[PDB]
RNA sequence: GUGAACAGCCUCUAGUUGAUAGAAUAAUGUAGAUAAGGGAAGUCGGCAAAAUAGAUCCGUAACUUCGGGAUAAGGAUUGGC
RNA sequence: UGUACAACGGGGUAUUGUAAGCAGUAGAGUAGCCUUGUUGUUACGAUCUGCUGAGAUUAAGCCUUUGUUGUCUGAUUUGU
């Protein structure tokens, strides 16, 4: 079984999903789903399409180079099946993926910090440049307090 | 699915694609083969006057002069600037074979890049001298 | 029993698969049946200010959610209907999302 | 051939492809490779010395944990001449104006 | 199955009916093939005998050498371009239709095969797989 | 207003808002569509549908009453700023 | 008179592909008030980048619900 990625989508293709395409140069183009497949025929560019992962690794979004991401490459030399490798890899894959998420969430906070600065500078323009609307709300509070009275 | 997209993008009427065309420009031997094809009866310009960027045969040498000075052919020049998007770019996006990916990007930056640009410079040096 | 409430109404799950020449006339009959369930009276008077609020984007562009105010009122003498009827009128809001049914106080 | 014939014929005898190969311990000759955990199938992860390469990763936690690099918790806002009472009002006045 | 084909042949999607022009994948000199009938086919009212991947069809040649044209000869289909089902969970399809030509014993006429050869066709016919440069 | 145009589509002045209506969305119809792979194997017969279509530049055969054939055929192109 | 039923709302799944709004030292170029420039700038300027996998839709024959507000004795007929 092979969880191989979409050619266009970079999402996992579980066994039983998606179409394969084979070029006459004989390399295989496995596809996530029909949306990615019909967009491939039409000669698009996933550097340009915003929803795919090839855009997001290129356009300065979600982190691309990491020491945790080099653990799952491919192996063309088979490792002869010792069990005590297998018992640690089932503990390794639960450990690499946690450090992946603690770095990816921390990479998201570098990209979204200081929004509250621009959130508050946006509010100084709305409040201060509308003096006439702020008179209307003052009588709205006084009419609110008087109805309870 | 639709009407217009079926007419041009069936399996029968598929063009070459962007992957192989970057390989043809990347070396000096495959450029000289395609510029100098042996003449064939089953091909539109009788196996001459072939553009390498757009995988497309032209009827006459006049039809290369008017094809290069167009917004259609200035897509494919601007399309083939960078790394040609193999399968390896899509696998690196999921956290899978970075060192296979980053070494190829290292080679396109160093070796394959300026060999391609010194080939596309000579095509404009040749297709202006003959046309 | 004179009671005024607020409501939203999901018209997207009511006008699903209707002919386009009959969407906006159908949305009128849906609000009458929607007021008949909640207020429990038969004859429902829609204000003409709400009739503008349905037909505003044509016959086939009825909005998804509207924000209603429904008041149930006393009726006059020698009406063979009932002592009760509803009077549905709209309240205008920035967006009709994320609101729920609220009783409007009397004064 | 003859081991096949004594228990069933040719279309019904079932060859164990295992029990004929060389491991350092024959006690686990019948066990099962998992081949998949949650995502990212197992044969891309296993190696010689996975845990020894994982020691170098766990050093990079403590090189990044003590530096304040994983600091999600941030609770105050500090502007010029502004405090928590006043910045709450301006974010409450500008919310009223948008509606 | 018939003569030459070792083993059995599973059900795959029937891409090529009668009168379907397909490319020629060897170095024999034919350019396109033209199917007239499919061997091992059924018999039902108003159907067309339809070929698939890894079948043997009787096929004529429209474009090629004048030594080869105007004689019916068997041919084995190696590419389909209609999506079929490998029994591991994937559908797949090729770029074009293609077929090599052979004697009824199943032995190749040319010496090489251009382009990729289908996997189900290469299992069913051994002499194709000796001349196949690329599998899948 | 778009455009070669009194073509077609949209709006101002002026005029109608008349043609039995409500509720449901089975078959078979009438009117209009889209289909993987193959491409006339259908059929008396390519009937019907599809494809081509405006404009600019290049190019254009036999034949002939020299006027035609001719938009012959076949190609390159078309937005916004 | 409650594992009640319904109307909205809140989560979960999915669908398309980055909302309005401001901002930028992005932007082929051209003009100017000129402080006659030593990015001379404010204007115009297709588009691009940032807030933004944001925004919109989500059962009409999807899943789920400790929230909000309601409703819960109408009519007919039947006996060896």
UniProtKB/Swiss-Prot annotation, chain A:
It comes from the Eukaryota. One of its GO terms (cellular component) is cytoplasm. It is found in: Cytoplasm; Nucleus. One of its GO terms (biological process) is ribosomal large subunit biogenesis. GO terms for molecular function: ATPase activator activity; ATPase binding; structural constituent of ribosome. Signal peptide: none annotated. Keywords: Cytoplasm, Nucleus, Phosphoprotein, Ribosome biogenesis. Its main location: cytoplasm. Involved in the biogenesis of the 60S ribosomal subunit. Ensures the docking of NOG1 to pre-60S ribosomal particles. Activates and recruits ATPase AFG2 to cytoplasmic pre-60S ribosomal particles. Belongs to the eukaryotic ribosomal protein eL24 family. Associated with nucleolar and cytoplasmic pre-60S particles. At the end of biogenesis it dissociates from cytoplasmic pre-60S particles and is likely to be exchanged for its ribosomal homolog, RPL24. Interacts (via C-terminus) with AFG2 (hexameric form); the interaction is direct, recruits AFG2 to pre-60S ribosomal particles and promotes AFG2 ATPase activity and RLP24 release from pre-60S ribosomal particles. Interacts with NOG1; the interaction is direct. This is Ribosome biogenesis protein RLP24. The gene is RLP24. The chain holds residues 1 to 149 of 199 of the full protein.
Swiss-Prot record, chain B:
It is found in: Nucleus; Cytoplasm. Belongs to the ZNF593/BUD20 C2H2-type zinc-finger protein family. A zinc finger (C2H2-type) spans 49-73. GO terms for biological process: ribosomal large subunit export from nucleus. Involved in pre-60S ribosomal particles maturation by promoting the nuclear export of the 60S ribosome. Involved in positioning the proximal bud pole signal. The keyword Membrane does not apply. The keyword Cytoplasm applies. A motif (Nuclear localization signal) lies at residues 7-16. Residues 17-31 are annotated as: Nuclear export signal-like (NES-like). The chain holds residues 1 to 131 of 166 of the full protein. GO terms for molecular function: nucleic acid binding; ribosomal large subunit binding; zinc ion binding. Associates with pre-60S ribosomal particles; released from the pre-60S particle very early in the cytoplasm. It comes from Saccharomyces cerevisiae (strain ATCC 204508 / S288c). Present with 5630 molecules/cell in log phase SD medium. GO terms for cellular component: cytoplasm; nucleus; preribosome, large subunit precursor. This is Bud site selection protein 20. Disulfide bonds: none annotated. Keywords: Cytoplasm, Metal-binding, Nucleus, Ribosome biogenesis, Zinc, Zinc-finger. It comes from the Eukaryota. The gene is BUD20.
Curated annotation (Swiss-Prot), chain D:
This is Nucleolar GTP-binding protein 1. Present with 28000 molecules/cell in log phase SD medium. Associated with nucleolar and cytoplasmic pre-60S particles. Directly interacts with RLP24. Involved in the biogenesis of the 60S ribosomal subunit. It is found in: Nucleus, Nucleolus. Belongs to the TRAFAC class OBG-HflX-like GTPase superfamily. OBG GTPase family. NOG subfamily. The gene is NOG1. It comes from the Eukaryota. The chain holds residues 400 to 498 of 647 of the full protein.
UniProtKB/Swiss-Prot annotation, chain E:
GO terms for biological process: cytoplasmic translation. The modification N6,N6-dimethyllysine is found at residues 105, 109. One of its GO terms (molecular function) is structural constituent of ribosome. The keyword Ribonucleoprotein applies. Pfam families: Ribosomal_L14 (PF00238). GO terms for cellular component: cytosol; cytosolic large ribosomal subunit. Component of the large ribosomal subunit (LSU). Mature yeast ribosomes consist of a small (40S) and a large (60S) subunit. The 40S small subunit contains 1 molecule of ribosomal RNA (18S rRNA) and 33 different proteins (encoded by 57 genes). The large 60S subunit contains 3 rRNA molecules (25S, 5.8S and 5S rRNA) and 46 different proteins (encoded by 81 genes). This is Large ribosomal subunit protein uL14A. It comes from Saccharomyces cerevisiae (strain ATCC 204508 / S288c) (Baker's yeast). The lineage of its organism: Eukaryota, Fungi, Dikarya, Ascomycota, Saccharomycotina. The gene is RPL23A.
């Amino acid at each position: 079984m092979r969880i191989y990625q979409c050619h266009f989508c970079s999402s996992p293709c579980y066994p039983g999903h998606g179409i394969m395409f084979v070029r006459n140069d004989a390399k295989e183009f496995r596809f996530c789903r029909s949306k990615c497949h019909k967009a491939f025929k039409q000669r698009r560019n996933p550097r340009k399409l915003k929803w795919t992962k090839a855009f997001r690794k290129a356009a300065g979004k979600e982190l691309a180079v990491d020491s945790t991401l080099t653990f799952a490459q491919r192996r063309n030399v088979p490792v002869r099946y010792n069990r005590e490798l297998v018992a640690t890899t089932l503990k390794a894959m639960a450990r690499i993926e946690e450090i992946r998420q603690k770095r990816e969430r921390a990479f998201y906070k570098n990209r979204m910090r200081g929004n509250k600065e621009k959130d508050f500078l946006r509010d100084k323009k709305l409040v201060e440049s509308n003096p006439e609307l702020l008179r209307i709300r003052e009588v709205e509070i006084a009419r609110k307090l008087a109805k309870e009275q | 699915m639709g009407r217009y997209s079926v007419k041009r993008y069936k399996t029968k009427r598929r063009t070459r694609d962007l992957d192989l065309i970057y390989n043809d420009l990347s070396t000096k031997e495959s450029v000289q083969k395609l510029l100098n094809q042996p003449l064939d009866e089953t091909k539109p310009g009788l196996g001459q006057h072939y553009c390498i960027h757009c995988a497309k045969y032209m009827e006459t040498a006049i039809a290369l002069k008017t094809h290069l000075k167009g917004k259609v052919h200035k897509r494919r020049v601007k399309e083939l600037r960078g790394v040609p998007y193999t399968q390896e770019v899509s696998d690196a996006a999921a956290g899978y074979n970075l060192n296979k990916f980053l070494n190829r990007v290292q080679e396109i930056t160093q070796s394959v890049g300026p060999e391609k640009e010194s080939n596309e410079a000579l095509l404009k040096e040749h297709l202006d001298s003959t046309l | 029993d004179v009671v005024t409430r607020e409501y939203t109404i999901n018209l997207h799950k009511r006008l699903h698969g209707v002919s386009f020449k009959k969407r906006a006339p159908r949305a009128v009959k849906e609000i009458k049946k929607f007021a008949k369930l909640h207020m429990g009276t038969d004859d429902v008077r829609l204000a003409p200010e709400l009739n503008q609020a349905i037909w505003k984007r044509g016959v086939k562009g009825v909005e998804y959610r509207l924000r209603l105010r429904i008041s149930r009122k006393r009726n006059e003498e020698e009406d063979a209907k009932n002592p009760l009827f509803s009077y549905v009128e709209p309240v205008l809001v920035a967006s009709a999302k994320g609101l729920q049914t609220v009783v409007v106080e009397e004064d | 051939r003859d081991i096949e014939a004594e228990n069933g014929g040719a279309g019904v005898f079932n060859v164990n492809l295992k029990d004929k190969y060389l491991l350092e311990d024959d006690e686990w000759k019948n066990d099962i490779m998992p081949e998949i955990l949650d995502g990212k199938n197992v044969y891309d992860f296993l190696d010689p010395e996975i845990a020894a390469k994982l020691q170098a990763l766990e050093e990079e936690e403590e090189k990044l944990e003590n530096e304040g690099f994983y600091n999600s918790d941030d609770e105050e806002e500090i502007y010029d001449g502004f405090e928590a009472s006043e910045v709450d009002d301006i974010k409450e006045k500008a919310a009223w104006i948008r509606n | 199955s018939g003569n030459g084909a070792q083993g059995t042949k599973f059900r795959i999607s029937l891409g090529l009916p009668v009168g379907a022009i397909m490319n020629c994948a060897d170095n024999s000199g034919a350019r396109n093939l033209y199917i007239i009938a499919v061997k091992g086919s059924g018999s039902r009212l108003n159907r067309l005998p339809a070929a698939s991947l890894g079948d043997m069809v009787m096929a004529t040649v429209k474009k090629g050498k004048p030594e080869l044209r105007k004689k019916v000869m068997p041919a084995i289909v190696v590419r389909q371009a209609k999506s079929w089902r490998r029994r591991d969970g994937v559908f797949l399809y090729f770029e074009d239709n293609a077929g090599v030509i052979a004697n009824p014993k199943g032995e190749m006429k040319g010496s090489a095969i251009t382009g990729p050869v289908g996997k189900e066709c290469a299992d069913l016919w051994p002499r194709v797989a000796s001349n196949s440069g690329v599998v899948v």
